[PDB]
Design a protein around this ligand. Structure first.
Ligand SMILES: O=c1cc(-c2ccccc2)oc2cc(O)cc(O)c12
Ligand SMILES: O=c1cc(-c2ccccc2)oc2cc(O)cc(O)c12
Lengths: 115, 116, 116, 115
């Protein structure tokens, strides 16, 4: 898969498990079209969101439902979600890992783009 | 004023100056209405976006044009922008500083939320 | 003054108040000499650590006692502290803001380095 | 291995490869004793630093030579290194991933502590 999402929990020092992630592709009319989604695994990872064929150049938004995560942990979060918006560009580097490190009032996102 | 956006450049170790910031507020119809915009100053701060009166409860989106910022520095960054989406003032008015720390392939955003 | 330490709490979205900060400067004998210390104020800032005259070129270590901070909040954090080690003023005097953003198992530190 | 170090490069959006990492254990006299070291792999990872047997409770310092990394990339860095200092506590969670995300003037470190 050319796209992987990895979410870490900076409060618990753990993968952020069962975090809903939605991926959207910007449509011609500048709207976000749902493209894929999943929940992060026990390892805080979400694999298999897309395929090389499907994951064409375009602007993608990865929306990480951080709020539900924090709500599940009983911790007041600031953000509604973490939205990572990027242009996928052909095609090297090929693989995108979108890693998000979550704190209740802060998140960081990083892209590890590799071949 | 209750909403300040601060943008720092993690490559240069500097404020991120002249960064366009667009603030949107989720409307009743669940669309993003333009709320305010500006650009960061030499201090990487953007003040005066709104007022206590205008900054009512709502879901706000602060979209920081990090791409233009990096592009102006010759960098093709990963992100189109840094988007900070949050419910504001739901427990009464607060002063929000939305700080973004930018790197070409990473950004972090933090909110420092204090009482008026 | 040329060295400021700012500490933010990423859990609370607040300044990290009363955080002990110890600054050391690498001596000629390559040991860490105590340089300055203080604690962050209500704004999570620690000012007045040093002066232009005293803050000469050197390798400085800012050790932020994040553990005591979290522990006081009932949290057993991962890190003993956040340690920021850097060469200062090597291209002439600069004003350094060392910002740390703290979470129990993570911290980030940034330097905003500006001219006097 | 109970300890893994992972280093990412926030400028290039890549693993931070060939980054020297030194691990130290605080000795009884409060000095740092070198314990282990390595360079991060192509994946920005450093495995096999220690073993469960050797990695007893104590205060450890992971010193990531970020400066040499940035120097190799021709980018002026701020920090001499990134030092992650933590108490290893028995023994759950067992495995420590010390992840560092590097920028020239900023780094973040996170511990992902799992079983
Ligand atoms: O250097 C800074 C970095 C961050 C900051 C922002 C997001 C993630 C990590 C650090 O916030 C700051 C707030 C300030 O008032 C002053 C600062 O110098 C900083
Ligand atoms: O602990 C981690 C933190 C970040 C990470 C992500 C965004 C901002 C700062 C750190 O990325 C990771 C990627 C990995 O493959 C494994 C990890 O343990 C981490």
């Amino acid at each position: 898969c050319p796209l992987m999402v990895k979410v870490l929990d900076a409060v618990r020092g753990s993968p952020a498990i069962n975090v809903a992630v939605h991926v959207f592709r910007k449509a011609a009319d500048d709207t976000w079209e749902p493209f894929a989604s999943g929940k992060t695994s026990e390892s805080g990872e979400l694999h298999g969101l897309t395929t090389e064929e499907e994951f064409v150049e375009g602007i993608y938004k990865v929306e990480i439902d951080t709020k539900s995560y924090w709500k599940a942990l009983g911790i007041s979060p600031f953000h509604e979600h973490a939205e990572v918006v990027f242009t996928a560009n052909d095609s090297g580097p090929r693989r995108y890992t979108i890693a998000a490190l979550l704190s209740p009032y802060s998140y960081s996102t990083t892209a590890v783009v590799t071949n």
